[PDB]
């Protein structure tokens, strides 16, 4: 139900610093760790196991100071046992001392866990030194835990603060990942069979991924495809090499599509179920073609020539150190000069054409830099790739690669 | 034993008073003379205590006000008002606290006073008052320093005896104050700097790690004291104390080290040992960025080695995804064949993960003005950190390491 | 003054940090510095003195301790290895305080 | 020359007078078509060479008499969409209160026009392309206003790149019908003569001129000035104890990473003396002011609009 | 009144309690021709416009039904996971609704969608927009406002409290209308907050995406894009909606009003070339309707045929002579017999009968023309090479401008059609015979039993006979409407005025007015020095201001102590900056040529 594996030393240290209920612990512990290292899971299981009064608060949900303080105080008032309101930090400290004096909570360490705490440094300045010194300010035997992915030195305010004990939850190596993934074996099939499956999956995906959640989800998805030989009967439980040879090319296709989330999980399990092979689904990518009006097409392939070409060469290509650095901003007069040059027919400066130039920007196809003097508005940039402009130029029968560079 | 743990945990975790004072006798003599001058006579005074973080400024005022309170016929007539910068950020909340701690919230009624000074004059008219202003520099950043001016003006002018003690850790505290309030301020400064040598540090070690004389289990108490004498004279304990002394001479870090070494002591292992201080010193001295880079994937390490070559060649010039991808392409062709030969989206996903950990930083911060590529970013790792982290990188393929050396 | 006796009663690594700042300012001839050059000189001074090799999270702790007081005013810690470090007290005062 | 001297020399008369006298009643003929197309759900924008102010004012006199109409001056420097929202809310409607935001007040007046159809309002804008009403938020608020069926809007544009303001989303809101009125009247009202090459400059800087001089400058310099703008703002609350000091300014601007040396700040305060921005009252026995002469409300409205 | 140092002047009709206003009909008649005619034409306009508006809004509801069937199927599939579920790390189901480039018509496309959901899946559907959600607090405030409307420091827990209050079962559906315009931070924060608590608050998101779906990658990072189960959907094409609405508004004989060829070219060019917005086409049709019923007095006769002839029967004398002086009738009497020439002009009672006969002839000409048009389109689409057009509207334009067989284009479609397979011809005449089925009350029933005979035959000689059959048909019934008498009653041909009102060019007007003042001032002001001052300065600068000042002084003194010429230069240069031609630089006193044309 609630097993923690390969975290024995870390749970030993937390259980040591918590100690006894009457004893006073550190005013603050700052747990930091690389992603999917079991911060929330280990802390929640340990706090639930020991039966300590504790509050779990996520700071992403509490984007306002009032919401954070209100959430903490209401959850403590439910732990003690209608609606208490607190606008400021001082009202939090007064009402916090008020709710802490209940008979169940007079003589026990009251924990306030704050998960995803890197969003506490974007809020009010007194909030984070206020929470670090909460045992000093309130004097009510209170311990706060900050869980984060970010190292401690970035958090430090300019005026200093009550420095906390910085703890490190280490990453899972290959063995720890194998003995946490193989633990929840399917009841139908052999445990060694599922263990060899985890061995080949970790063999493929260790290089690009060391995240527990992503590997567990990819192990869930690709498992019916793995046991299809033993279901069809062409191979048995102990014919490991045949099973690995079957699933070895398929795992690369699952790395290039599902791992990048091009094709959703439901479409993927449909592909393994109905036996339709992958590679026949376009996915969210490869749909880079948008049906655009004629003038907006020529404006866009003129702004790409304005942005990615130096002004010194502009004379040679049109009147008669690379793309690596990016798009160079251009003035609007260059856009109109290129637009009038490349279009074969006469173009009049109508209201609709300027409305199209200021529309591409709203549709995030173009982008203005500066954001100053909107009526003059000369500065613009092109945010689209080579293939999109090449496809549009091919549609209206224009040779973009002749004009880009020699 | 439990009682030893309880007493020493209140000594280390909470900053609870202990009897002796280390090298602050003259400063305390000044402070106690001015408090007895204010309380016994009718003189009104102002003090601005200056000292670095954790140098016991609150220790001095708590012990001085405690001995002041011990004096007969002082306790009945003296009122205290504790105000703090981190709690009260605006002067109306400060006014609310000054009414509330003086127990005049019933007396003040519903009347709204025309001026701030009139409200303070009404409050003080219904017997000396002491005003401990913690975090004085946070009071100094108010809108026009109204509360500080009114407090200093009432102490200078009004008959009502008032002492205004302020606590700061800034040596420019008399440059933040505006010209009128410096003139109203009597220049009395008590500097609590950490002026003690290394043998005095070892003496504070042995004084702070020893049991009190009112401990009931006396027979265990004397052998615990003889044990901490032998521990203080030990060589390796002296070495780890020297390593902690070189960083800082602040007793808060010493109490953290002693708490960790104390917390290792259990029922089976009933006495402290040199290896407890050595391991507790090993826990504190961890390097954070090496712990993060240890957690990374292999592909993110290949990206970091490419970024290190980019900053090596084009020195102090920012980069985008395209240059690091091109250098990584020179890797995947130049060293190896058909190994590490990934596509662009998975490399982009790894680069975006490096951005998530804040090991790279966007040089210019805009609001959606730039696409994901062509965005100029800087590396937040020094070269020697990268070499140290690759040095003990678990099983780093000889290919990537040989790329890293050259 | 307060700043001179504050520098004199400071620890060993803070004084070596202030010496790295002085030598790096002599090298640069400017009143500001990126934290990288200060750390690269501080490594060499710790090697010369005989002190052990300082990790980045100890040097950042020393720098934020000096910046917590006003012997030095630096940028917010949010940006790392990219700070602007300037002296708040005069260089001759620093040499007078460290010469003892 | 002076701008006052420009006001004095009004002796000249137009050469083609009889020729240009027939170009007014010709456009006066189209008034019934314009009023009818207002009632059917279209809006009219006028584009031309001369001043359309007299034509719109004659349109007010002849037709829009027995209606609750509102005239808006884009050419006035001290105008904002907040002001036109106040003008709709407080006198046209009988509300007497303060609203939290411009969007919250816009939704209140929009809802007020929803529950009742007895209200009809005619909203004239003499220039819709002026600097104050150039913002996309401003045109978004005006587009939310004009799309109702109980309110009508006639506006004129003068600038050559006016069609850049509206895209396909915004011009869906405005049912524009473009009518050319190429009269030849001079721009006597809309040419303020301020920040022109006439050397005479009157009073405190208007907000448009303050912004225009302040944009073409170093970003550090914008910060340096914002410091004193915010200080002078918190100091001006009573006339007593007014004035900053130059050593105190060096302290505040060294705390922040803006200025490196004192000579750099002296060079900066001379650059502000160059554009008549700073008033150096240093050497005064009480305090060495270094204050700004620009009106305080204009300073608040600049700082809120600056980003 | 309007000149004061403030920016808002509000005039009210207060202290005069006569708030009665003119009815709209009074604005319609600005002349003294015939007021009863001018009040009846305004009722006819409103009737025809309501009919076209209702027909379009029914048509769009009919067209996009197929997309909504698949989308309701997907939202019925997705909620089964919440019915089983104990979050079990469930993802937020989302549908990427790839709409078009156009932005104007989307407000229709979502609205029907909203109603479809309120009939089928949920009773709780709310729509949000990027313009009124700058931050998370406003986002959640409008979320809990529309959720409470569908049935104070609001938080996601307060949303779940409302949900457990009201349900005590359906999902809640949030439609993000404009995916492009949202701030990145509020999207990532809403996804991360909502993902944790979805087990008590079921949430299904539709993203309204104008461009390609790669925008989902651009705004949302990979750490947030893996919290969504995403399924792609594609909407209508703009071209298909255009051809459908043209077939159901113009080409139908139900509506009496029509448009000319050049008006159709203008409205098709401003669509194909600038923006694929059908609502601008509906705007152009409304404007053409308003100008046709506002200009022509005899357009009261433009109605359905019973009402048309009862309106013919009772007319004023002035309307009768307006009929008599119409150019189509004036050439009609010229080809008519010599007794009948004086018979029409002298007697109005003969005229009232003759116009009824001519209007009925025009209506049956339209019915025959459109039926033969659909059959010719069946032959046109069946051919591979697509000569005249791919679509119905290109064919209608090219037949409407000039006779097709008069042009040499039609010989190509004949010679391609003449060599053809038997099965293809069987399919073609099956399609054509179900076109003759499609429109009842035919006046071409002889052709219907003929094409029954050639279908009943089902070689190269009868292939030649059926191709010559459609050839004789297309010579017989398709003719341009200008060759029909009394056609200016139901036709509107004012291309240039419509082009100027819809698609203006305010830079050409300024450039022409400054370079040539003689067009608007015909008082001998230019042939290839006497001009308004703005013209004089404008011609000279095409740039230091003092040399420009002395050049202007020289020119205006050639035209005639003078201080006034320098003052005129100050005014002229100041009013040139208000029109965007002069920009102050620092190299000289000034040097700028940003017009560059
Ligand atoms: N030892 C373990 N045994 C079983 N499951 C585990 C173990 N460690 C972690 N998990 C899984 O990891 C998840 C919790 O990971 P956690 O949220 O702590 O990662 P994180 O590093 O906090 O992620 P983030 O980078 O988002 O902060 C749980 O769903 C749990 O199932
Ligand atoms: N000279 C000293 N004499 C006695 N105890 C000391 C001394 N220096 C430090 N301490 C101990 O170290 C801790 C000092 O922190 P304390 O709360 O007393 O003030 P502080 O932390 O300096 O105040 P602030 O939080 O404002 O910096 C206390 O536990 C105190 O017992
Ligand atoms: Mg977590
Ligand atoms: Mg303190």
Strand content of chain C: 5-15%
CATH superfamily of the domain at 2-191 in chain B: P-loop containing nucleotide triphosphate hydrolases
Give me the Rg of chain B, rounded: 30 Å
How many alpha or pi helices of chain C? 5
Instruction: Characterize the largest beta sheet of chain B: strand count, sense, and whether it forms a barrel.
Output: 4 strands, parallel
Global morphology of chain B: flat
SSE series of chain B: HHEHEHHHEHHEHHHHHHHHHHHEEHH
Strand line-up in the sheet with most strands of chain B: 1-4-3-2
The CATH class of chain C turns out to be Mainly Alpha
Distance between the termini of chain B: 58 Å
Put the structure in a nutshell.
The complex is a heteropentamer of chains A (406), B (406), C (100), D (307) and E (597). Chain B has 406 residues and is an alpha/beta fold.
Architecture overview:
Chain C: This is Origin recognition complex subunit 1. The complex is a heteropentamer of chains A (406), B (406), C (100), D (307) and E (597). Chain A is α/β, with parallel strands linked by helices. Chain A is built from 19 helices and seven strands. Chain A has helices spanning 8-18, 40-50, 65-80, 89-100, 127-132, 134-138, 174-181, 191-205, 212-221, 223-226, 228-232, 240-256, 265-274, 294-307, 314-319, 332-342, 351-362, 386-395, 400-404, and strands spanning 28-33, 54-58, 110-115, 142-148, 165-169, 366-367, 381-382. In chain A, helix 3 (65-80) runs parallel beside helix 4 (89-100), helix 7 packs across helix 8 (191-205) and helix 8 packs across helix 12. Chain C has a single domain (2-99), classed as Arc Repressor Mutant, subunit A (Orthogonal Bundle), CATH 1.10.10. Chain C contains five helices and three strands, in the order ααβααββα. Chain C is globular and about 30 Å long. Chain E has 597 residues and is mainly alpha-helical. In chain E, helix 8 links the parallel strand 4 and strand 5. A five-stranded parallel sheet of chain E has the order 3-4-5-2-6, sandwiched between helices. The longest helix of chain E is centred in the middle third of the chain and has 35 residues, at 348-382. In chain E, helix 2 packs antiparallel against helix 13, helix 17 (338-346) packs across helix 18 (348-382) and helix 21 (422-438) packs antiparallel against helix 22 (445-457). The chains are: A alpha/beta (406), B alpha/beta (406), C mainly alpha (100), D alpha/beta (307), E mainly alpha (597). Chains D and E meet through helix 2, helix 3, strand 2, helix 5 and strand 5 of D and strand 1, helix 1, helix 13, helix 24 and helix 25 of E. Strand 2 of chain D pairs antiparallel with strand 1 (8-11) of chain E. The structure holds adenosine-5'-triphosphate (2 copies) and magnesium ion (MG) (2 copies).
